[PDB]
Amino acid sequence: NNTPVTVIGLGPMGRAMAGAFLAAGHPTTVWNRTPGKADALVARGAVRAATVAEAVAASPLVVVSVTDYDAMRAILEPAADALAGRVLVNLSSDTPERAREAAAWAAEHGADYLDGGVMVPPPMIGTPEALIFYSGPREVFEAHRATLAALGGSTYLGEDPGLAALYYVALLDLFWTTMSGYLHAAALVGSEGVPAAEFAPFATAIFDSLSFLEEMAEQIDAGEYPGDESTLAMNAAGIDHIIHASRAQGIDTALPEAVKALAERAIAAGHGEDSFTSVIEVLRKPA
Amino acid sequence: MSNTPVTVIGLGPMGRAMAGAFLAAGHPTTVWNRTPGKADALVARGAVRAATVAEAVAASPLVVVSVTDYDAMRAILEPAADALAGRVLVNLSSDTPERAREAAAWAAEHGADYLDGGVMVPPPMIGTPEALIFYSGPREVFEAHRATLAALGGSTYLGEDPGLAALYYVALLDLFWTTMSGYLHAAALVGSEGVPAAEFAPFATAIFDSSFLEEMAEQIDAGEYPGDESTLAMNAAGIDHIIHASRAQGIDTALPEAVKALAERAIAAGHGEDSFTSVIEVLRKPA
Numbered sequence A: 001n002n003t004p005v006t007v008i009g010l011g012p013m014g015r016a017m018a019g020a021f022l023a024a025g026h027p028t029t030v031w032n033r034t035p036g037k038a039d040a041l042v043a044r045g046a047v048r049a050a051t052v053a054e055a056v057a058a059s060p061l062v063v064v065s066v067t068d069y070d071a072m073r074a075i076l077e078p079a080a081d082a083l084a085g086r087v088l089v090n091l092s093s094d095t096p097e098r099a100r101e102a103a104a105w106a107a108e109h110g111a112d113y114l115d116g117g118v119m120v121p122p123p124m125i126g127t128p129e130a131l132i133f134y135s136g137p138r139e140v141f142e143a144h145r146a147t148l149a150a151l152g153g154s155t156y157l158g159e160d161p162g163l164a165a166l167y168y169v170a171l172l173d174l175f176w177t178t179m180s181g182y183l184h185a186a187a188l189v190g191s192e193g194v195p196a197a198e199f200a201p202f203a204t205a206i207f208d209s210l211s212f213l214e215e216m217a218e219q220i221d222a223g224e225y226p227g228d229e230s231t232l233a234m235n236a237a238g239i240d241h242i243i244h245a246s247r248a249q250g251i252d253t254a255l256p257e258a259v260k261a262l263a264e265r266a267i268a269a270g271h272g273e274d275s276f277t278s279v280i281e282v283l284r285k286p287a
Numbered sequence B: 001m002s003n004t005p006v007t008v009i010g011l012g013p014m015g016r017a018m019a020g021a022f023l024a025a026g027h028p029t030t031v032w033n034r035t036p037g038k039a040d041a042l043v044a045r046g047a048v049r050a051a052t053v054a055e056a057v058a059a060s061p062l063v064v065v066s067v068t069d070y071d072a073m074r075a076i077l078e079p080a081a082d083a084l085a086g087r088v089l090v091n092l093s094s095d096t097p098e099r100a101r102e103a104a105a106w107a108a109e110h111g112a113d114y115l116d117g118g119v120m121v122p123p124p125m126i127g128t129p130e131a132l133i134f135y136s137g138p139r140e141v142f143e144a145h146r147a148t149l150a151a152l153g154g155s156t157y158l159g160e161d162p163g164l165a166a167l168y169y170v171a172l173l174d175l176f177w178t179t180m181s182g183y184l185h186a187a188a189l190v191g192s193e194g195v196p197a198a199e200f201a202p203f204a205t206a207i208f209d210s211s212f213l214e215e216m217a218e219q220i221d222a223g224e225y226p227g228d229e230s231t232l233a234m235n236a237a238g239i240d241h242i243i244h245a246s247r248a249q250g251i252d253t254a255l256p257e258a259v260k261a262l263a264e265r266a267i268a269a270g271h272g273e274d275s276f277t278s279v280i281e282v283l284r285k286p287a
């Protein structure tokens, strides 16, 4: 496949995507608002477009990887009319609603539109280990799936453009919450002189089974959260201990308190005898 | 390799696993539980069910206690407070570092040696090399009994402070329940569009496996948080999208609101251009 491709936005993700398109043999044209981020890509045969319009004109497939909808629109407005008949693959949707605005805006200028999302480190881009997911017209995805495969694995999610954006914010939700839990744990143990370097191996070990993911999934889908011998009321006591320990060590407690509140809400609704997974019930209900 | 008599007090899932491990390693094992009926499989494998706590403590130089918390541990051991002198008490059920210290001081006052233990694995892992149990307390005591504790799995000494094992335990529990909650928020995010959890899990599992925990520990230990190409200010704006997407999907927003509030504190402290790891600077500071 030698379909020409354009990549707009050369943050670390845009650069890895352009690099992957080149490595797969596509003629790649790149553009960034800030000059000087394209040197390695040019050295590997990318063409550095001088204007957005020239960038859009170079390819039937335009991949946009910039901060958000507002940046995407300001970038592309001067060349909006040049989008007619091309496919815009957008990895810059900050919300499911903005993705649908973006799809509509693209439609009013003659362009098909896929929303895209990937939650992997840039270096994994262009390897089978990168899982990229898309939503939007299935016929548009099927038509370009072979070019997009240069980026890694591809998953079609369905026709609603906001789907990919929804998955991305969810994964973003899991990531930053996880990262915050880690830093809270490091501060907890740090309050006794335990260096984060010494604690990190225990922390990573916590994540080596990843069994909880399928088991919680199966519980959520079946709508049944069998408590067994590690119930939610038990788990709430554990989170109490986190709070107590945090207070007594000087560490801030806002984060474990928020977790506590969620568990309490689930116990106040009769799941105190169910597994932790049953907390999804109160999460579906703004409080 | 054993026949050393071991007593296990508390026959919840962990205690039964531990008693089974001691039996498998060849140790004459006495068990006692508040609730009768949970010892049948252990007695078939050779364990002795003790009539009373006092009898169970007396049976063995080494007394392992895995119950809910210190308060329960103290309730059961009250009638056996005389029998304790001359033994070592291995507490695998301290809820907080402070309760572990209280336990140690209480054991000392009754003529008993004291080791605090933190178990970081599910009960099925106990007794296998996948189990890693950390201990704190007097090194001599830990050394003299390591060969018996080896029946449970790996053993790691953390230091002389008896609260250390509990600290590691609660920090790991803090990372665990915070991650679970993030995962459920995510799942509730996609679920609000009819997406099955079953499906979403593949992408969540990829978050892990792809890591940087050791990278953030280096930064924590240096006290230097280089922003590079993803600063705290950009991460916070991202978290804002999570909140906004959550409100639009009608999901509860308490958990991401809590992550965002932590980010905003570190930005108010002047870390907006540093990496997210700099948020630890406001965790060490009760707010």
Ligand SMILES: NC(=O)c1ccc[n+]([C@@H]2O[C@H](COP(=O)([O-])OP(=O)(O)OC[C@H]3O[C@@H](n4cnc5c(N)ncnc54)[C@H](OP(=O)(O)O)[C@@H]3O)[C@@H](O)[C@H]2O)c1
Pocket: A009, A010, A011, A012, A013, A014, A032, A033, A034, A037, A065, A066, A067, A068, A070, A071, A074, A075, A091, A092, A093, A094, A116, A117, A118, A164, A165, A168, B229
């Ligand atoms: N898949 C998704 O749905 C999705 C959505 C958002 C973010 N992300 C991920 O988040 C990470 C980084 O997020 P990010 O892309 O916001 O950060 P980033 O790495 O800083 O990339 C932002 C890009 O947007 C450009 N940009 C921003 N505002 C602009 C404007 N007003 N006019 C022109 N260009 C503008 C920047 O150009 P300059 O070089 O000129 O600054 C840069 O190329 C990446 O891993 C990315 O994949 C994924």
Ligand SMILES: NC(=O)c1ccc[n+]([C@@H]2O[C@H](COP(=O)([O-])OP(=O)(O)OC[C@H]3O[C@@H](n4cnc5c(N)ncnc54)[C@H](OP(=O)(O)O)[C@@H]3O)[C@@H](O)[C@H]2O)c1
Pocket: A229, A230, A234, B009, B010, B011, B012, B013, B014, B015, B033, B034, B035, B036, B038, B066, B067, B068, B069, B071, B072, B075, B076, B092, B093, B094, B119, B120, B121, B122, B123
């Ligand atoms: N996988 C795990 O669950 C896990 C992992 C690591 C560490 N731990 C720790 O190991 C310990 C035991 O946990 P577990 O998994 O076995 O489940 P658990 O539900 O914490 O076990 C509670 C045990 O304490 C006893 N108990 C509670 N209150 C009592 C009281 N007032 N008087 C007398 N006995 C009382 C219970 O006896 P009854 O049977 O009569 O109720 C039971 O044997 C806890 O400290 C827990 O944090 C557990």
